[PDB]
């Protein structure tokens, strides 16, 4: 038997962190996108 | 025609195709070049110019 410990590659976190990390996914080559969202979070400003 | 009678030099036929070249070259390149208010905006940390 053998146990493990797996996680993602990266967890950015602090107040004011969304517009700055997203700059990292356009300095690398990425041209096209797709989004998923609930219906309550589309008629409002999120 | 009013700068030839006083000054005393120059031909009237060449000061007409020089007054039209220095008044439309200067309205074909400096038309859209922002020099008022805000120029640019980079928002990795917050700066403006």
Curated annotation (Swiss-Prot), chain B:
<comment type="similarity">
    <text>In the C-terminal section; belongs to the iron-containing alcohol dehydrogenase family.</text>
</comment>
<protein>
    <recommendedName>
        <fullName>Bifunctional aldehyde-alcohol dehydrogenase AdhE</fullName>
    </recommendedName>
</protein>
<comment type="similarity">
    <text>In the N-terminal section; belongs to the aldehyde dehydrogenase family.</text>
</comment>
<comment type="function">
    <text>Under fermentative conditions, catalyzes the sequential NADH-dependent reduction of acetyl-CoA to acetaldehyde and then to ethanol. Under aerobic conditions, despite the reversibility of the two NADH-coupled reactions, wild-type E.coli cannot grow on ethanol as the sole carbon and energy source due to the down-regulation of adhE transcription and the inactivation of the enzyme by metal-catalyzed oxidation (MCO). Nevertheless, in the presence of oxygen, AdhE may act as a hydrogen peroxide scavenger and have a protective role against oxidative stress.</text>
</comment>
<comment type="subunit">
    <text>Forms long filaments, called spirosomes. Forms rod-like ultrastructures composed of 20-60 identical subunits. Two monomers form a dimer in a head-to-head arm-crossing fashion through the ALDH domains. Subsequently, two dimers form one helical pitch via the interaction of ADH domains in a tail-to-tail manner. These units are further assembled into spirosomes. Formation of these spirosomes is required for activity. Can be isolated in vitro in a wide range of oligomeric states.</text>
</comment>
